């Protein structure tokens, strides 16, 4: 999984 | 074009004994501050500008000398010691007792305390943590050459404001560069704590700070 | 003073088995560091130094002094390495011994970086006198005077690149961000270093030996 | 000893 970044990113 | 004025603004923005208490509070503060890198980061002109992938690349790749850099320099005004996101002031005998000593001690001699020695400034921290952020040695960039001329912006920007704010101090620039060696193995070392705090259950499970560890 | 030309000349002065690429890296590596001494001598003020601070300054940087020299020496070769054995590392055989991820960070970090700039001679005698004039390295009697030889190679590496490339502005910082990618792959390839050791590949008694116990 | 370095240097 490992997207904690980039729903960050993506506001 | 990249603005040391924008950079400095990105700062500003986001930036104001027990043996295990430097472990936790390094752990809790490390997961603290990545969320806040995010913001940080989204501020530097042009990051967002490049492909997600990308910046999901660099900061990946770049976090944790990012915050190395950043609490080095908030540790200034630290007599002998490291001042924590979370607002705990780690101290030689108590770092020692953690099993963090070693890097203790290469902390405050090869980052705070030369960076408090000569008196670097948040413009100038941005700037380098922006050159950190834009590091076209990543793996897997989609295009590294646009990393490497937002990297080279920086570092134009940085030196024109620094012979223009400390015209009295031509080396200035190159040392700020010169710094960076040992922010480097300083992050190795800090990340390789890391690990070994993971292998044996100190870091909290299902963070931001374990899902850098584990991408 | 620090004359850019003495550096140069300190520079010109000294320069399928799965089992070849570890065999020759640690005779090259050995090989090597008696050349880096007589190298290091003939940077301006260095032998002025303390002997233990000598002492202590070579053995901080000797891993990064040898690792820029083989880099640079590779420019000419085609997707490898040169050691200084004569042995061409070239990317299969480095993965075969185990050393093909440092292989993949040295092409792509340090050899193919000073090749599409052209880095000369000089630039990368003055970055290497950087390197030995470390004032972070630990126990010198005297830091400050350590950072004020480092000080004095930069400004004179500096107003070289603005006297020879005109053009190109930023190359005085682009050499220097080249260190903190010779500073990680240093501990990489000193890592591999003491598994060589850790598992006897590495030959006993000699000058490479004495770098990693004393 | 260790003192190969040393010695070199003289
Ligand atoms: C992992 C580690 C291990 C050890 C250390 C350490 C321990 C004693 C003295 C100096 C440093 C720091 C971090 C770390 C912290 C942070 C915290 C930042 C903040 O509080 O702002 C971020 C990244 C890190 O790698
Ligand atoms: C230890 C190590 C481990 C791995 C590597 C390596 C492996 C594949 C590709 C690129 C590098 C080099 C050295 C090493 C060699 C030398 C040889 C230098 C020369 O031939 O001039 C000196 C210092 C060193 O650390
Ligand atoms: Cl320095
Ligand atoms: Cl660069």
Redesign the pocket.
């Known amino acids: 999984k490992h997207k904690i970044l980039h729903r960050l990113l993506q506001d | 074009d990249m603005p040391v004025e924008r950079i400095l603004e990105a700062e500003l923005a986001v930036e104001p004994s027990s043996p295990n208490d430097?472990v936790t509070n390094?752990?809790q503060?490390?997961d603290?501050?990545l969320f806040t890198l995010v913001e940080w980061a989204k501020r530097i002109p042009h990051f967002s500008e490049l492909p997600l992938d990308d910046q999901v690349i660099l900061l990946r790749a770049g976090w944790?000398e990012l915050?190395?850099a950043?609490?080095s320099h908030?540790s200034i005004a630290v007599k002998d010691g490291?001042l924590?996101?979370?607002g705990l002031h780690?101290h030689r005998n108590s770092?020692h007792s953690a099993g963090?000593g070693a890097?203790?001690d290469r902390?405050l001699t090869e980052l705070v305390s030369k960076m408090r020695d000569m008196q670097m400034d948040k413009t100038e921290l941005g700037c380098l943590r922006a050159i950190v952020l834009f590091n076209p040695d990543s793996k897997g960039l989609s295009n590294p050459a646009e990393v490497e001329a937002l990297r080279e912006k920086v570092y134009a920007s940085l030196e024109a404001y620094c012979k223009h704010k400390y015209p009295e101090q031509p080396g200035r620039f190159a040392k700020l560069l010169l710094r960076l060696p040992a922010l480097r193995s300083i992050?190795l070392k800090?990340?390789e704590?890391?690990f070994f705090?993971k292998l044996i259950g100190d870091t909290p499970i299902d963070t931001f700070l374990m899902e850098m560890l584990e991408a």
Request: glycine share 4%.
């Open positions: 430097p390094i752990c503060a490390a603290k501050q944790n915050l190395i950043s609490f908030r490291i924590l996101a979370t780690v770092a963090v890097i203790f902390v992050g800090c990340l704590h890391l705090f």
